[PDB]
């Protein structure tokens, strides 16, 4: 259906030990495609999907060129943050941008994101009209007073609007047959009795993509929301995921649950009970 | 491709 | 303001003794970035483990994934082993195969 290409950008700073580590990721969907690290032997962007491997020489001197200038442009963002914020210079600190595209089922813009953090919290963002700024504080307003004064916002939106989903609708064909594939969860019901009274139902979807699921376990056709255990969804390290939910129900009562399983994979919800 | 940021 | 790691450590496929698998841990939401994790073979660390590159969620916090191949059997006992700022001493986290 629905897809987006999004770059994660961090940079660290570490005084004493050397200029402050940049690393950029790129990702079409929970599929990430390209990596640049500063603290490679050689930083280069380099492919971390099959199908980006196909884009020529051109393609990766580009991409290399566009990371190594945002390296320095990050480490002089540091520097004037720091600034900004009264710190010394004896302490580490983070920034952080993800910015990209998403786009509908038939390749059109459906927003655009150039979002920032400092030290983990939100700095500044570029609303989603992609011509005005949101700013978290007084130092994220000097940023703010800067990029309007470069039209720094009309910079993002010819990005967004053309370069960002151009290439996401190139990846989405080049990697079809993955980036559009959907894989269901393989599901179970597992059974551990805890006491003489209580057990623990567990329902498990494994080996799906994309990452959105929903397990919700029910009793008498009522959502346990509260009583349910979820944990974070995971990756298993083949592209896909994992995740569970855990009920503990009462001895003799495990039929008056069921998991329900939605996935974009499956060609109709499950309704899942144990079955001793 | 990405974009060539600016500076804060 | 800084975050702890969450910790999950499972195996890529239903684990089966004797058989070849994957053995995970998962971190993420924490804050900073600079993270140690080890994969523990009957307490010993495994040598040359993998981990992906570092990403991050909407809420900003870090995620990353560190695997190597393992062969389980009924008797090895494996485990991740995470130190981070927050942190006072190193987290040890148990593999139990039905989690």
């Given at each position: ?7 994660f ?9 050397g200029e ?11 599929t990430?495609?390209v990596?640049?690290?500063?603290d ?13 491997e196909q884009?020529?020489?051109?393609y ?5 060129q566009?990371?190594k200038?945002?390296?320095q ?7 004037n943050l ?7 210079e004896?302490?580490?600190?983070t920034?952080q ?9 038939d ?6 994101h150039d979002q920032?953090?400092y030290?983990?919290?939100?700095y ?8 005005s700024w949101?700013?978290?504080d007084?130092?994220?307003q ?11 916002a ?5 990005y ?11 990846h ?6 993955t ?22 139902l ?12 929903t ?12 009583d ?16 569970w939910?855990?009920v503990?129900?009462?001895s ?17 919800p499950?309704?899942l009970?144990?079955?001793p | 491709?990405?974009?060539?940021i600016?500076?804060? | 303001i ?5 910790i999950?450590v ?9 058989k070849?698998?994957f ?7 924490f804050?900073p ?8 073979k ?8 993998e981990?992906?590159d ?5 809420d ?8 190597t ?5 009924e008797?090895?006992?494996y ?21």
């Amino acid at each position: 259906g629905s897809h987006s290409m999004r770059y994660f950008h961090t940079s660290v700073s570490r005084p004493g030990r050397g200029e402050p580590r940049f690393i950029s990721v790129g990702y079409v969907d929970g599929t990430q495609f390209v990596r640049f690290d500063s603290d490679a032997a050689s930083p280069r962007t380099e492919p971390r999907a099959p199908w980006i491997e196909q884009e020529g020489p051109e393609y990766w001197d580009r991409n290399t060129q566009i990371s190594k200038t945002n390296t320095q442009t990050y480490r002089e963002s540091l520097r004037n943050l720091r600034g900004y914020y009264n710190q010394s210079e004896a302490g580490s600190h983070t920034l952080q941008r993800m910015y990209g595209c998403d786009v509908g089922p038939d390749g059109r813009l459906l927003r655009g994101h150039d979002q920032s953090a400092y030290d983990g919290k939100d700095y500044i963002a570029l609303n989603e009209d992609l011509s005005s700024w949101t700013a978290a504080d007084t130092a994220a307003q000097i940023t703010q007073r800067k990029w309007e004064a470069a039209r720094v916002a009309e910079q993002l939106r010819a990005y967004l609007e053309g370069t960002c989903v151009e290439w996401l609708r190139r990846h989405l064909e080049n990697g079809k047959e993955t980036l559009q594939r959907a894989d269901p969860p393989k599901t179970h019901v597992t059974h551990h009795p805890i006491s003489d009274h209580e057990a623990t139902l567990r329902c498990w979807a494994l080996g799906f993509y994309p990452a959105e699921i929903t397990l919700t376990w029910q009793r008498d056709g009522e959502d346990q929301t509260q009583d349910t255990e979820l944990v974070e969804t995971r990756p298993a390290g083949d592209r896909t995921f994992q995740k569970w939910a855990a009920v503990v129900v009462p001895s003799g009562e495990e039929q008056r649950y069921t998991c329900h399983v939605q996935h974009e994979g499956l060609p109709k919800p499950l309704t899942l009970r144990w079955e001793p | 491709s990405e974009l060539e940021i600016k500076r804060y | 303001i800084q975050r702890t790691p969450k910790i999950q450590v499972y195996s890529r496929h239903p684990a089966e003794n004797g058989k070849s698998n994957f053995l995970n841990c998962y971190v993420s939401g924490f804050h900073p970035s600079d993270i140690e994790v080890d994969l523990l073979k009957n307490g010993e660390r495994i040598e040359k483990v993998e981990h992906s590159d570092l990403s991050f969620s909407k809420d900003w916090s870090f995620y990353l994934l560190y695997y190597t191949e393992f062969t389980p059997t009924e008797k090895d006992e494996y485990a991740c082993r995470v130190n981070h700022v927050t942190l006072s001493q190193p987290k040890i986290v148990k593999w139990d195969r039905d989690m």
